[PDB]
Design a binder for these strands. Structure first.
Lengths: 122, 72, 48, 113, 215
RNA sequence: AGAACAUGGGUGAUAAGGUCCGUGUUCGAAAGGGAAACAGCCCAGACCACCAGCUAAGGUCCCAAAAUAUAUGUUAAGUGG
RNA sequence: AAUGCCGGUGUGAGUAGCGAAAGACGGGUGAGAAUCCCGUCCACCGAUUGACUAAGGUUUCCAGAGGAAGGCUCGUCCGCU
RNA sequence: AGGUUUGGCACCUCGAUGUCGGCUCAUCGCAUCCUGGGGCUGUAGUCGGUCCCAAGGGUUGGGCUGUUCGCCCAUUAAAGCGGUACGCGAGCUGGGUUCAGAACGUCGUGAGACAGUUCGGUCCCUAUCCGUCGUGGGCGUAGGAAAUUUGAGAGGAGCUGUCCUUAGUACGAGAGGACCGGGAUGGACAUACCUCUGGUGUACCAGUUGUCGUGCCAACGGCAUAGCUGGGUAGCUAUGUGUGGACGGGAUAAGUGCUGAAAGCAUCUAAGCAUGAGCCCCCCUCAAGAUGAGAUUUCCCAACUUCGGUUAUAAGAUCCCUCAAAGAUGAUGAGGUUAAUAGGUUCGAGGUGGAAGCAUGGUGACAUGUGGAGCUGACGAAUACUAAUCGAUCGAACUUAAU
């Protein structure tokens, strides 16, 4: 469950290790987001180089929250930490590599460019 | 238009004369009789001597009722 | 927070309408006895 | 205890196929993923950490890291998306809920056999 | 349309073919019979009267509701039936069917039907304004002295009174509720129970009514 | 410590239930009838009794006393061009 | 009729409150016992709610009798008579 | 001209009408922010400009300032403008300002001042009446009762956004881009159920463990926040799971439409002539005969009577076990069968291997069952053992018409 003001970990390659969420995109008064949703955020810790730098206000997608999602058969997929992939606003990743596993909700969310880059899709 | 309030906030209701005469015309006549009587307890009793019927048929044959013609 | 007018005799005695004691039962004691708290474990002049 | 009507009307959908679990066992679970038209199987492997419930609404949980990031997977005992259960190992624990595991690296502060 | 009569038992889950998790309430409807047919020519409207589970016979020194008294024992003797514990009317049905005394089976409903369920809520007792109307409980620190109280109750000397329906504390809810547009998942006739997809108002073993959905 | 009203004027903005003079009335210190209610507006000044009569101002379909009165006309709207 | 002075009696009302603090059961005395006496358990203070010593107070100290008032309930008890 | 927001006036209140912003909770208006209808264009076309009609419902998260106001960051369909003692302090706070301390500046001979700053500075009340939200007692209603109801009349619910044709057609010498049709779709808010699933908590549930004091080893019990740590039954719950929502009918407002004269040409109107919404009503949910009167089914008095009333009647209170109900009343489940409550016996579910004996191992410890054992609260079943198993109280005329 990602509100505003939550620190979120970045799981791809660019000058971005760390983001703080500005706004949960969606409806009015929408409070939280989860896997499949899109937030707007600022970069708090970067690496020297890369395209994104510190102080940039960017979009991202959620992959692998700690409060995992529910399926129809009543099955769950919780993760140990909250991750993030910075996206380019054409449904496409602004980096070039994806680290760690990614959940299948992105396939139904039409994130299929990010689906092939990542190892271990569940 | 006829008006009434329910003592509930914004609870003013209404109905126009023609459609009150078209549905429940007995109320239409007895309301305007009873508005012409004193509003004491004796007056509200005297309004209970009134029987209104839509259509030319009534049940009160044992009382032996007489025709009265409006002497204007 | 304070009463604005005093209370009159009529009003105070109206309020005391229900401030009553309930009559205790008045049932005959079954095994042996007389009128009592109904369906009791009645021992007063009896053996219920 | 629930009611004989509750067991009678769900009693059919129990599956009498599965082995006997104990929290602390390693299992590989063969789950069935659907697509356009091809029912692919993918396998989840991990240690069992909790089992709660009774009757039809039973549930268990298996934990796996395998990529650097721990992953949980919870699912019904009698759900028909499961093709079979293979008990990998047995392992000896002292608790019924293996919750003792911030988590990353090898900082899973758990005890194994 | 249809309608039988109730007493829910509890909740369970059932697996849907094509693979689903479906939470369900088990409603047992046994011992129903038509007791009386209201007719528009005699009563002004058309309805049937149904009695759900049956009680004991009239007993001499019988005083709990477990036995039937003389008047209700005489009623439903015209219907060739045993005394019932619940009697409700169904005026959403077609009275030209339903011979008086007809045993309404639980398989009048077919898995797939859209139904309405009515019942009585659970009774939380006396509650105040946070629980009962969903208010906001102002601040817990910074010197604050109002936590669960309600705020103001009106304006100032203009309209110098409180209006109707001002949402104060009181008795929470033991009301009549109807949940529309639920579904029959399964009709089990050996045990005479109904599976309904969802939740039902009231506690366990309380009376419920099931009807064909109007919309 | 005065007040409203109509008429004559100043001040103010051809404002004020504003303020300042002049000529009257009424309230103040005045009960009664009318204006729905309503010191100052209209009629009228209560020594006491009466289940007598004539009138004022205002009124006469019901509330609520008295014309659903006459005869003869307007109105169709109900209460800068 | 002076938010007059003194006395008596209301209303609010059977309402607010009864001043931090372990108690259970058995037996006894009594017109009357949760409350007094006697147990056997159990809890509390535990550098003190322990033992002295002051100032200060002035018979409150002991025994037997008593329950009108006092004791925020009761009382057969008491620093009360 | 219309409505009264900086001012004019001094009519109520100085034997007190006591407070700016913010918080909590509202209720009205329309002079319309979004959504809904329409039309105009110097609208090629989307864009747009521009108007009129429309008041049901909605109308946000932060950074800076005590702030009203104001500038900024992100969203959203949208982030309107007003009244109500500039709504609301016997509902809240107390940052600003009118209090006693102190520093600075300016101006005063000085005591002091300014209106400039800056730091620090005690927010009382047990609800009588009316009002509001809940829940009872009394009486009533032409025989008394028990159960089902009708509905005069009340209250509550009408909001929104994506992906798909259409369509790349209209149109675009270029780059740019019309409107319009179906099911659906799965969403955001806010409503009202409920605990099967994920989770929370659980103070008479099982386990591990540290100090100390008692019965002297150990095993128990006491106190250390429930001593602490790890799990967790039922009940109660959100962050969990279900469900609803313009509207499911046409029809109306500037507007668009038809035929047609004074004014013989002309004319959307003049008589006539249709539509276009959020308009109606419908619908949907709940409560409802104290609606001072509306039913239907069954039961009981065959008397007694001066049927004025009495006893028996149908039936309800009294009392006692209780909970699915509950401040209390009330409302349900029960009272000698029987399963209301408790014990006992079995489950379920919880937590996870008790003792005694054996086998070790130097010993701390392990094994290991012919041991997923022993323990177990509120869950469930069955059961006569302990109990609700006696008995009194209260209670049954006028009139026409027939037949």
């Amino acid at each position: 469950m990602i509100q505003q003001e939550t620190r979120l970990k970045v799981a791809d390659n660019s000058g971005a290790r760390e983001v703080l969420t500005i706004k949960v995109l969606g409806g009015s008064g929408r409070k939280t987001a989860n896997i499949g949703d899109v937030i707007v955020c600022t970069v708090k810790n970067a690496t020297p180089g890369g395209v994104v730098k510190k102080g940039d206000v960017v979009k991202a997608v959620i992959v692998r929250t700690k409060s995992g999602v529910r399926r129809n058969d009543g099955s769950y997929i919780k993760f140990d930490e909250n991750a993030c992939v910075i996206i380019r606003d054409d449904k496409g990743p602004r980096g070039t590599r994806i680290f760690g596993p990614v959940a299948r909700e992105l396939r139904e969310g039409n994130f299929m460019k990010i689906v092939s880059l990542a190892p271990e899709v569940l | 238009v006829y008006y009434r309030h329910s003592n509930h906030p914004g609870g003013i209701k209404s109905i126009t004369a023609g459609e009150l005469r078209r549905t429940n015309p007995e109320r239409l006549i007895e309301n305007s009789i009873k508005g012409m009587l004193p509003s004491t307890r004796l007056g509200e009793k005297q309004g209970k001597k009134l029987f209104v019927y839509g259509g030319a048929e009534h049940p009160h044959a044992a009382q032996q009722p007489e025709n009265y013609e409006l002497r204007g | 927070a304070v009463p604005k007018r005093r209370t009159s005799k009529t009003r105070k005695n109206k309020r005391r309408t229900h401030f009553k004691i309930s009559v205790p039962g008045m049932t005959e004691c079954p095994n042996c006895g007389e009128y009592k708290l109904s369906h009791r474990v009645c021992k007063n002049c009896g053996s219920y | 205890t629930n009611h004989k009507l509750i067991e009678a009307v769900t009693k059919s959908q129990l599956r009498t196929d599965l082995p006997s679990f104990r929290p602390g066992d390693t299992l590989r679970v063969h789950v069935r993923i659907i697509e356009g038209t091809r029912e692919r199987i993918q396998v989840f492997e991990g240690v069992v950490i909790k089992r709660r419930g009774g009757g039809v609404s039973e549930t268990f949980t298996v934990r796996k890291i395998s990529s650097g990031v721990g992953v949980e997977r919870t699912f019904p005992l009698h759900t028909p998306k499961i093709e079979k259960i293979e008990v990998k190992r047995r392992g000896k624990v002292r608790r019924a809920k293996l919750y003792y595991l911030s988590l990353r690296g090898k900082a899973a502060r758990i005890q194994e056999i | 349309t249809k309608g039988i009569l109730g007493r829910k038992i509890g909740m369970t889950q059932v697996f849907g073919e094509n693979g689903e998790l479906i939470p369900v309430t088990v409603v047992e409807a046994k011992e129903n019979v038509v007791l009386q047919k209201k007719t528009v020519e005699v009563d002004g409207y058309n309805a049937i009267q149904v009695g759900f589970e049956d009680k004991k016979a009239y007993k001499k020194d019988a005083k709990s509701n477990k036995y039937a008294n003389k008047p209700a024992e005489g009623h439903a003797k015209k219907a060739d039936a045993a005394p019932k514990r619940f009697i409700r009317e169904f005026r959403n049905v077609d009275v030209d069917a339903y011979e008086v005394g007809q045993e309404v089976s639980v398989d009048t409903f077919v898995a797939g039907d859209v139904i309405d369920v009515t019942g009585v809520s659970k009774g939380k007792g006396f509650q105040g304004a946070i629980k009962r109307h969903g208010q906001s409980r102002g601040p817990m620190s910074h010197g604050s002295h109002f936590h669960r109280a309600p705020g103001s109750v009106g304006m100032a000397s203009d309209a110098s009174r409180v209006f109707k329906g001002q949402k104060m504390p009181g008795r929470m809810g033991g009301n009549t509720v109807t949940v529309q547009n639920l579904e029959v998942v399964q009709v089990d006739t050996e045990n005479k129970v109904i599976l309904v997809k969802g939740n039902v108002p009231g506690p366990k073993k309380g009376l419920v009514e099931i009807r064909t959905s109007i919309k």
